[PDB]
Amino acid sequence: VSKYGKSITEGVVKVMSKMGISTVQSYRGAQIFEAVGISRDVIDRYFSGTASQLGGIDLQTIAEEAQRRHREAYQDDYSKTLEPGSDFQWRNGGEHHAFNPKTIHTLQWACRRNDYN
Amino acid sequence: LDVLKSTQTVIHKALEKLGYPEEVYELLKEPMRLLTVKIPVRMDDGSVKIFTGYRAQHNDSVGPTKGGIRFHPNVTEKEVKALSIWMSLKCGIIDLPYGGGKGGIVCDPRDMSFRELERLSRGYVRAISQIVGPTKDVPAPDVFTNSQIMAWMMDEYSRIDEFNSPGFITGKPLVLGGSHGRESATAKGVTICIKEAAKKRGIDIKGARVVVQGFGNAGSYLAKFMHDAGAKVVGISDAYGGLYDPEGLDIDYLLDRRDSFGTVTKLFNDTITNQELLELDCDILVPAAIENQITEENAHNIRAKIVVEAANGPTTLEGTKILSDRDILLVPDVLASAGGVTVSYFEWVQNNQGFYWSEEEVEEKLEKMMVKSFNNIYEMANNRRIDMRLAAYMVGVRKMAEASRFRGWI
Amino acid sequence: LDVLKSTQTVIHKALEKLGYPEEVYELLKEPMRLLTVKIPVRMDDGSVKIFTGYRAQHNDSVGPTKGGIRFHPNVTEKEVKALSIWMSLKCGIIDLPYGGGKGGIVCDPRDMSFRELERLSRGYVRAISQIVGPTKDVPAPDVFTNSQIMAWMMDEYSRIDEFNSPGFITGKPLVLGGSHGRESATAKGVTICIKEAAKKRGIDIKGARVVVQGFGNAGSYLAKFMHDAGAKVVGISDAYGGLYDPEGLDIDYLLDRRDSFGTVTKLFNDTITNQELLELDCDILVPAAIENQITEENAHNIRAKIVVEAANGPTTLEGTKILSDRDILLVPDVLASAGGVTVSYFEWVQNNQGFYWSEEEVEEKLEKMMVKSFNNIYEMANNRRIDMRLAAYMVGVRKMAEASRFRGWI
Amino acid sequence: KPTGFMEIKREKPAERDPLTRLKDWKEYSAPFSEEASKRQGARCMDCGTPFCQIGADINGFTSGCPIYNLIPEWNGLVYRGRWKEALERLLKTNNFPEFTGRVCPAPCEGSCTLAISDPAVSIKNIERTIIDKGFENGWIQPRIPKKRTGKKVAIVGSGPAGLASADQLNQAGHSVTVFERADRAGGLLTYGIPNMKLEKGIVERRIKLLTQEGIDFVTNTEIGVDITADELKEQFDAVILCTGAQKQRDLLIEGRDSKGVHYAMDYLTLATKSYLDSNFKDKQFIDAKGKDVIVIGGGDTGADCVATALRQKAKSVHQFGKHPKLPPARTNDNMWPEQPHVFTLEYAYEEAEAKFGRDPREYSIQTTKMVADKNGKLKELHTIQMEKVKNEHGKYEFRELPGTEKVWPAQLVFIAIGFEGTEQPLLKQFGVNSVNNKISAAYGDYQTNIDGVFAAGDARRGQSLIVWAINEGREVAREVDRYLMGSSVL
Ligand SMILES: Cc1cc2nc3c(=O)[nH]c(=O)nc-3n(C[C@H](O)[C@H](O)[C@H](O)COP(=O)(O)OP(=O)(O)OC[C@H]3O[C@@H](n4cnc5c(N)ncnc54)[C@H](O)[C@@H]3O)c2cc1C
Ligand code: SF4
Ligand code: SF4
């Protein structure tokens, strides 16, 4: 527990150092995030001061997403295991990635053969 | 599960060593008055849940009884009786006019709210007001309990008795009539005990190497007192690690930077685990941290000449035997951690007298009591070839048994 | 072992039938104040043995508590709590201002001596004097207890309170301020109950055939009262057998020849066992003898229209079900054997008032109370399609639960 | 810092010696010991974007474990030494480890990242070791799903796909029944695959576990003439058609009428049934102890036929195949993302080479056959050499060499050159439509023309592997669960 707390504090300090705010007290008020995909109305209502370009999803969509996740997780009536993540690695059936094995080996084969098709 | 049986066994051993008959053991094995009550309570939502209460008076031959109160959700009758006997042993060791006792409530302060705790305490007093009074019982602060609960209890007992009784309950706020130094009592007690132990063993306090693992209020105040006295601190530890410096650690700076929790370790610096901290060279070691730390594996690695168990039973029987064989002085926790009881007694005396002492007077009286008790137990433990834990238990039981014999219950 | 669980289950059933929430069950399942004490005692030889005491107050919302005291060597906390709840049910059924309770001591009156019993009782009162008083508790006679012990207890409470309190304890000797008819209370209660049951079921009391197995004081007085009323007795039994005569048995002669024990069987004459006695033709059957007599085998053989369980649970659940199916009125023991409690209450009222009534006044008041209670329970049991035992338990718990709800503990 | 892939050299478990492999009908290999298994598991380098899990058709050949085994995860767990967790992770996805480990040809071994110029990690052997140790320790116990809703699915066919679908449906909570013609359930796993590969004790144990779950198999029900499709539909809501693919193509060449020519499937089924019945003492099988044996049609079927003939102690065995002998290493037109085509030398061939001293040779390739002999039994077989040549537009063509005619003595002959779709038009009681004897359906959404009829396994896949069958069974189980109850996570 102590090591996890220390590591998380070190990470928070690193994130602070990324921006340049050297005080947690200052960063606390500071809103240094840029929502990517949140509607302008929602940003003005709840995240005033945050920068958003494309607007995006709404409160109803966020609620629907949360409810879907909660319902699936509390259903979970088939197995006692956590599905494998796909944030930092590719696992079949997981989150799609730009460089999947299909694309990788197709590109390699085409490049090595000099074939255009 | 084994707490009551262990308490009974140690009491039996002490009585056997004293040589009194088995009647005293028969009388003292069990508390003489155990009360179980049910406290109605109203929640914020309006629903009513019933909390189970407890109260035990181990003995009152010496005089008025005393005991703490823990809002621990796993409090049971066996634990309550064991704690009552333990508090009686503390009182006997310190030579107070208290008999001993303990109370408790089955609840969860975590999910409980502020007003709900207020109502809970008030219902508890309304429930047990009959067998509780200035000459019968005296609550005191304990686990999940503090000055606000003490003040509510005092206010209600004033209401029910129709006259002010500040001496009814100890551990009150300063404005309500509390006693100064209520927070540094344990630190002062351990400071006196370490000083006297060093004097008796010949270790000069000036320049003595000290290690204090566990840097709560007790650890912080103990370090400050050691620095003021002159002894150098060569180790501190907390929930986030520890440090090490053979030539001091600037206790003034450490206390200045001390936060609310007492955490002191740096952020981007490696720390030393308590397991390796225990092995560091030092004259006196002061485990005031999680229990069950000194065991067989580290018994051969310990190096301190004096070990003070400020915590509650941090060691085990095997470690105690190994230390005794190695001839390392082991201060019993019963005597190490009696500062709280002593300051509570002083607070009660101040309330009864109606006049409040000062910090210097409290300091002098507390150190006098502690040095006298430690000298008595040390003399008895050297007169009889036994362990200091056995000497402490024997001395504590002596007063209770002898007072019972005078009063003629046996 | 199962007494406490059975009591809790029947209480739960009664509360469920009433329809109150589960909070009343949570509060009433367990007595609100159980005290365990140790009583020092000096024997004739000079040695000291410690007796374990007990005391339980099931509830005091209605008013002052009440309970007996048994010097039974196997008394335990479970039995004490069960008896406290049972006494509370009795008080609720009879509609008294009592809440309920019970005390006891772990000892053996057999090997105990006279002066030693005196000292034992006196030490018991000195032990539990704090939570016992005219507005808090009221001891009463019970198993292995009688007028001499009541008188000693009264004398000591007078000593400790410094003023006379004859109403402190019931069941005292006549000269000390007792109440007349203390010995025939159970007989009078069962006489009223049998009369009312016969009236309600249409069985004419004049010429009614009656069987009374168990010829102690209760049986003797019941037979005498039946003979005075007009009903003929066609069977009696005791520890040495029984008799049988369809046209009377000269109850006057039987009572005249009655010995100290109540044995009446001849010497050189064959007798009838209780098993065959139960089967004899009769209108009303009154088992006042060893428990566990009416069972499945004799349920089909029983022939009486009205069965009164003057004893404590002489029947079983299977027998009760069979009798209910056969449509045989079954008087609950709780109502059958409440004469002792009623006369004790009258004695307490007389002491509190300071003026003593007469036999006729006690007779009239007792019969009025008994007839009113029996009529109320009969009406409720006919309004709700249930067994009379369930009706008795329900009526008894109604008053306690409703008083608690008024007083706001829930 | 894992470095096993270069600091360790791939090894193999303790195999029974070939010279004694021909006497006892038992498993010819054993799993790794603890230390060896840990060392082999350490080789895998926590491979990011693993190529052992793609499981998709690539250039006409499979690559990666189709059932998506969490290969990196349980390899890491095997290395770490926690075995119950590895078993749990394996059983999360796979349902028949005891068959997949000791049957599957392991395309995952052939195609992964570490297979670039170096031996691959023994995924198959690690899986087999995990499952065998789990079974030995008895951690596997029936699940007995508490929840159950009255329904009825009547899976048909006891093959691996049918068993997987039945297990998934039973875990879902729908009662199922398995209709099978053969005496014992299992399908190919019982009779087709040899005792060598799959000792039937393990199959029987797994079927008993399924019965304990409550599958409630029914035997000797060809669900054709015996039971009509209309009654089956009326009595059961859905039907998972795991009908199998057992029709084998025949060589339309003159001379294939004389007695002696036999089918590989029928011969293997007869031999396995005889062994399971009375240790082949019933004398109701095909014997070749004193006769020559020739098998036509290379592949797993040919290997199994050769092994069975060798165990029957035939005097001589020769395997024939048109495809030219494979090269000894990767070629220009073959790459590691694709399943390799290197010389394999699996079981039943090294054993033949070792045992045969007079003729220590095998793999007679580049010629299949033509018109055989006549006059009762087979006396001789004619053969001619063919070579793969480019024609038209660089298209492969088979042209015979006129001067390479040869004669071989053959009295018993087997044909295992391939297989066809399901047994159609025999099972025309339903309205399903077939294109090339295979019932028509697409990967996912197996709902065919008639409601409640779902394709599965080789019936729609043509010829595939047990892992493919298991994947199809799981997917069709999910599809039918969604069709019935609408919502189902898996
Ligand atoms: C290493 C390896 C080796 C292999 N070796 C062989 C081999 O030697 N021979 C071979 O043929 N395949 C072999 N295969 C292929 C494999 O056995 C099959 O592709 C697959 O197992 C069959 O799947 P299935 O679910 O259709 O099982 P199947 O057994 O095909 O399922 C059909 C089941 O239903 C029964 N059935 C038949 N007709 C009907 C009907 N009308 N109604 C109801 N039930 C019916 C069948 O008898 C059978 O029990 C091998 C595969 C691998 C990976
Ligand atoms: S089933 Fe086959 S491909 Fe999948 S992991 Fe096992 S051996 Fe490899
Ligand atoms: S088998 Fe190959 S792709 Fe799979 S985890 Fe190991 S190195 Fe990576």
Side-chain angles (χ1 to χ4, degrees), chain D residues 52 64-69 71 74 90 94 100-101 103-109 123-125 127 467:
Chain D
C52 58
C65 174
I67 56 171
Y68 303 170
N69 274 342
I71 294 149
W74 45 267
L90 169 53
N94 168 339
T100 56
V103 180
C104 175
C108 64
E109 293 179 353
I123 297 169
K124 178 183 140 192
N125 284 308
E127 211 185 53
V467 66

Side-chain angles (χ1 to χ4, degrees), chain D residues 46 81 94 121 123 150 159 163 179 181 188 202-203 221 226 231 253 262 264 289 316 321 375 407 434 440 453:
Chain D
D46 189 358
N94 168 339
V121 57
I123 297 169
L163 294 176
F179 296 74
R181 170 154 69 263
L188 271 296
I202 297 89
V203 170
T221 317
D226 185 7
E231 195 281 331
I253 58 183
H262 300 151
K289 68 194 301 306
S316 57
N375 309 298
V407 174
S434 59
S440 171
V453 181

